[PDB]
Each structure stands twice: as structure tokens, then as C-alpha cells.
Design a protein around this ligand. Structure first.
Ligand SMILES: [Zn+2]
Ligand SMILES: [Zn+2]
Ligand SMILES: [Zn+2]
Ligand SMILES: [Zn+2]
Ligand SMILES: [Zn+2]
Ligand SMILES: [Zn+2]
Ligand SMILES: [Zn+2]
Ligand SMILES: [Zn+2]
Ligand SMILES: [Zn+2]
Ligand SMILES: [Zn+2]
Length: 487
């Protein structure tokens, strides 16, 4: 019997060459034909994939990876230390100007000691490197295919995965078919997968209804109830890695005063916000890092208390609040309801905030491309996904004093001697204990200094036919379908 499943996704794909994509979706789909040395499961946990095992010098500089022998690429060629070298050399060559260059520029060189042994030496220590190797961007592509297609490799992928490219209709869909020579006997179980972009949200959910699609994501809030009521459809609300928050320019107006920051955090009723802006598909944030990320810490939740808040602003010296600005990035999602709710809650405590949604231009001009002594940024509503699955990318770009704009995304212009050093120390050790310890310390300082108003952490809403099993949504919004099957 023919097992042909259709997945209804959210947008169009950019490229099928992982190294050249900034959107998770395209990377997730390209996972049909590509595998990495390592990868993360649906709980965001480390797994050895094409790699058998690995070792790292106490110097943190040298990584020695053992590979599984006998694996073939979809074009008949062999997967070996040389192919890994070719994939890594290419990714770390700036001349290639591949969108994900920054994830490999720290690689000094890759050596093929033997067909099943790869020696990678970094320029500088970076304990999160193993995570970079498990990232869906680091795909092992066919050296032969890299040469045959050159710069068009992103259209005609050739990897070691369970599916081969059947055909791609730029706007219509990406259809992949079962690869007979897949290195794992018995897989895949499916004969084909058809990834179909469906921009209309209501239509996406509707297809699960008619049976037109067996899996879909994301699912609109209104359509959620409908689907969950259907016995042929399984609707899930899973944890994501999207942190929602409002940063405060800790070097400005009343925000320099830590009492104000502590105050404004009492002003927001988070459980109410999750209902009003996310339809209950999120949770109040009890940390600055989504708990699904490795090394994250969680704390006792912020109570909601307008009285405590107004009192604190008074002690601070603002018996009648004050006025400030609240910027958010222009979008069509839930942001709109978040702003209206927030400035309303802030109004209750006397904080007149002038909301403003900015397009790509103003955002890059007023928020990202601007330094402290110029920036107008005061209160900023935004979000962030640590797509590496570990604390560093969830913490450095947002709190490391060196990452203030236009360098990186520390919109709160926060800084702290200990945190910066704790973050730096973390990257120079590979001992889990030390790492959980170092990161835990930085987070405790951050949470207590409150440079933010951590709002919530979203929930991913997906749904699939009861018949489709082994098909999962990952916190980073990618898919895990190693053992997918149909009955
Ligand atoms: Zn490019
Ligand atoms: Zn050749
Ligand atoms: Zn040649
Ligand atoms: Zn076909
Ligand atoms: Zn065909
Ligand atoms: Zn249709
Ligand atoms: Zn399920
Ligand atoms: Zn109180
Ligand atoms: Zn728009
Ligand atoms: Zn199921």
C-alpha cells in the first residue's frame, strides 16, 4: 500500500541548502534529504546521527569525530571524513557568503585523519560548538553534488537522508520520495512526503478537515477548538522556544532606576495576557530563557500588583507615573493585542506609553542600527528564539554588554561585569556541571536586576491526522519524522 502524506506548512521555502537559509521551515523540510553529524530530538536533546561519537581536548580547541561507515549519499557516493571536510570548508569560507557563515567562522580547519575520523580545530574555545553541529543548518551534502550544481545546489539537494527530491515547484510544493539506499534498514516507512505552503491560515487547518493534508502547522487560534473536537484529528499545544518580552533601556529616563523596572513588572497580569493575546496558547514567563533550552533556569513567578507598582513608582519619585515610548516590530500576529493590553495595564499604574509598530526600515534604523548615545529606544516589545538549543545564544545576544546595537540585539543596553564573565567562562569549558552552574549564576543576576519584563513563552499549535504517527513538531518549529508512518 502507498503511504503518501501531505504536510500543510506556513510559508514558501527560501532554499533547500541549509547553510544558506535563515528560516527554520526550509531547513526543517530540507531535513528530508539531509542529516548532520548530530541533531536534536523533539525535547531539544542531543543525538549522534551520522557521527558515531566524538572527543574534545581539554584545550577546547580540538574536536575529533568518529563516523559511521558504509553510509552512501543519494547519488551513490560515500559519506566519509572527506565529505565532512568539504561541507565544513565550504561553510567556513567567507567567499561563499552563505547566510549561516557566522556559525562556522570559528572553525580554523577540518582534517580527514581517515575515512572515519574527522579532526576539527576551532580558532577559539566554544563549548556550544557541539550544538552548532546538531543545528539543522550543518547538513552533510554530497561533495559530488556540490560540484555538479555549484551555486544552484540549493535547488537540487543530494544528501544521506531517507528521501530524495522528486520535484520542486517554487511556489506550489516540495515533493520528496523514498530513498531505497537509505543507510537505516526499514526506513523510511513513507513512500513520499509533500510539503505544501498554505499562506491562508484558515485554509491550512481546513485541509486536515477534508483529509487533504495529514499534518499542519501553525494552526490559527479560532480553528483550534474545531480541530480538537474532531476525533480523526490530534491537536497539540507543545512547548516552544519563543521568548516574548519587553526590554527597557536601563540607561535612560526613569529606567535607570531599578525600582521602576521592578515596579512595571508587577503591573502586568501575565495569566490575563496569555488569554487575551494568545488564546491560552502560551504560559506566563518564569525566566528569561525558555525552559526547553539547555542550561536555562526558572524562578518564582512575578505577582500581579498595581498597588505595589504604583507605590514603588512613588518611592522612585513618580507620584503620577510618567510618559515613555513603547516600540514593537510591525507584524500581523498577536503583537497587536499584546500592545493594546500592555499600554492599558501600564495606564492603570500611570504610565502613558506611546506605542509604535515599525516596519523593517525604521526597526533597522532606530533599534538595531544605533548606539547608546543616539538610540531613542526606551521600551521595546519583541521576542527571541535560541535556535541552537543552548543558553549561550539565548543569553549573549541579549545581555552581553558587547552586543549593544548596532553590534547585536541587547536592546535593553544592559551590562554586568559578572554576567559577561560568566557567559565567557561558560564558552571555555565543556563540563556540563560547570556549564549548568555558570549559566545559572548569570541568569540569577539578570532576573534580579530585571532589565526586562519577561512576558510569556509561546506554545506551538499543530495538528495531524490520527493515522499519521511518528510525525512531530519541535520547539524550534522544525519537524522530527524519522519514524513517521501511516495506517
Ligand atoms: Zn549568499
Ligand atoms: Zn568530481
Ligand atoms: Zn571534477
Ligand atoms: Zn512526481
Ligand atoms: Zn516522480
Ligand atoms: Zn485543495
Ligand atoms: Zn501526535
Ligand atoms: Zn500589594
Ligand atoms: Zn505588514
Ligand atoms: Zn498521534
Amino acid at each position: 500500500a502507498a503511504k503518501d502524506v501531505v504536510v500543510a506548512v506556513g510559508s514558501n521555502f527560501t532554499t533547500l541548502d541549509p547553510y544558506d537559509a535563515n528560516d527554520t521551515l526550509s531547513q526543517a523540510v530540507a531535513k528530508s534529504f539531509y542529516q548532520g553529524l548530530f541533531g536534536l530530538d523533539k525535547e531539544m536533546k542531543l543525538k549522534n546521527v551520522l557521527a558515531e561519537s566524538y572527543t574534545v581536548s581539554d584545550d577546547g580547541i580540538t574536536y575529533t569525530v568518529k563516523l559511521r561507515e558504509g553510509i552512501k549519499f543519494q547519488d551513490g557516493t560515500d559519506f566519509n571524513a572527506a565529505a565532512v571536510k568539504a561541507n565544513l570548508d565550504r561553510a567556513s569560507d567567507p567567499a561563499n557568503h552563505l547566510k549561516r557563515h557566522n556559525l562556522y567562522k570559528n572553525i580554523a580547519k577540518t582534517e580527514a585523519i581517515d575515512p572515519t575520523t574527522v579532526k576539527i580545530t576551532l580558532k577559539q574555545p566554544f563549548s556550544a560548538f557541539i550544538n552548532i553541529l546538531a543545528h539543522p543548518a550543518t547538513a552533510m551534502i554530497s561533495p559530488a553534488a556540490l560540484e555538479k550544481y555549484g551555486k544552484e545546489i540549493g535547488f537540487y539537494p543530494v544528501g544521506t537522508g531517507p528521501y530524495e527530491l522528486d520535484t520542486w515547484n517554487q511556489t506550489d510544493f516540495v515533493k520528496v520520495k523514498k530513498f531505497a539506499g537509505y543507510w537505516q534498514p526499514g526506513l523510511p516507512k513513507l513512500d513520499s512526503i509533500t510539503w505544501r505552503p498554505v499562506a491562508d491560515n484558515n485554509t491550512r487547518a481546513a485541509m486536515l478537515q477534508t483529509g487533504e493534508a495529514q499534518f499542519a502547522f501553525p494552526i490559527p487560534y479560532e480553528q483550534a477548538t474545531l480541530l480538537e473536537k474532531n476525533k480523526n484529528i490530534e491537536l497539540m499545544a507543545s512547548p516552544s522556544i519563543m521568548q516574548r518580552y519587553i526590554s527597557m533601556n536601563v540607561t535612560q529616563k526613569p529606567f535607570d532606576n531599578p525600582k521602576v523596572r521592578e515596579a512595571l513588572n508587577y503591573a502586568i497580569n501575565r495569566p490575563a495576557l496569555v488569554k487575551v493575546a494568545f488564546a491560552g496558547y502560551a504560559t506566563p514567563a518564569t525566566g528569561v530563557v525558555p525552559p526547553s533550552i539547555a542550561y536555562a533556569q526558572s524562578y518564582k513567578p512575578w505577582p500581579y500588583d498595581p498597588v505595589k507598582a504604583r507605590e514603588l513608582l512613588k518611592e522612585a519619585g513618580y507620584p503620577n507615573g510618567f510618559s515613555t515610548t513603547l516600540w514593537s516590530s510591525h507584524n500581523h500576529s498577536t503583537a497587536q493585542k499584546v500592545l493594546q493590553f500592555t499600554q492599558q495595564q501600564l495606564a492603570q499604574v500611570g504610565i502613558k506609553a506611546q506605542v509604535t509598530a515599525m516596519d523593517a526600515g525604521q526597526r533597522a534604523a532606530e533599534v538595531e542600527g544605533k548606539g547608546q548615545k543616539e538610540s531613542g529606544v526606551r521600551m521595546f516589545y519583541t521576542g527571541w528564539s535560541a535556535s541552537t538549543g543552548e543558553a549561550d545564544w539565548a543569553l549573549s545576544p541579549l545581555f552581553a554588554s558587547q552586543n549593544w546595537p548596532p553590534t547585536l540585539f541587547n536592546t535593553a543596553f544592559y551590562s554586568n561585569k559578572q554576567v559577561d564573565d560568566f557567559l565567557a567562562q561558560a564558552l571555555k569549558t565543556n563540563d556540563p556541571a560547570e556549564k549548568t552552574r555558570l549559566y545559572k549564576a548569570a541568569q540569577d543576576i539578570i532576573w534580579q536586576e530585571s532589565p526586562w519584563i519577561p512576558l510569556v513563552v509561546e506554545k506551538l499549535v499543530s495538528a495531524h491526522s490520527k493515522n499519521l504517527t511518528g510525525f512531530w513538531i519541535m520547539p524550534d518549529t522544525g519537524f522530527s519524522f524519522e519514524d513517521a508512518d501511516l495506517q
